[PDB]
């Protein structure tokens, strides 16, 4: 049930994105921003499910140590 994280815009993740996890599952982007988290300041995505009203945020200079991939094409 529901659509997949398909692509069809450019390479970098933008706000209304789709994003899925290796086991979590799928969730929507809702908005963006950068911070300073335990001394290290980086881009800071905020998706938001819909599905059950869950929120998930990720670094997107940093989503290889997490190993998620979340883009208009990666999954």
């Given at each position: 049930a529901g659509h997949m994280p398909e692509g069809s815009a450019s390479?970098?993740?933008?706000?209304?994105?789709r994003v899925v996890?290796?086991?979590?599952?799928?969730?929507?982007?809702?908005?963006?921003?950068?911070?300073?988290?335990?001394?290290?300041?980086?881009?800071?995505v905020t998706m938001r499910r819909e599905e059950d009203g869950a929120v998930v945020m990720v670094p997107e200079g940093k989503v290889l140590a997490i190993g998620?991939?979340?883009?208009?094409?990666?999954?």
């Open positions: 390479l970098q993740l933008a706000v209304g994105d996890y290796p086991n979590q599952g799928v969730c929507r982007v809702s908005a963006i921003d950068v911070k300073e988290v335990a001394g290290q300041k980086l881009t800071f998620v991939r979340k883009v208009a094409s990666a999954e």
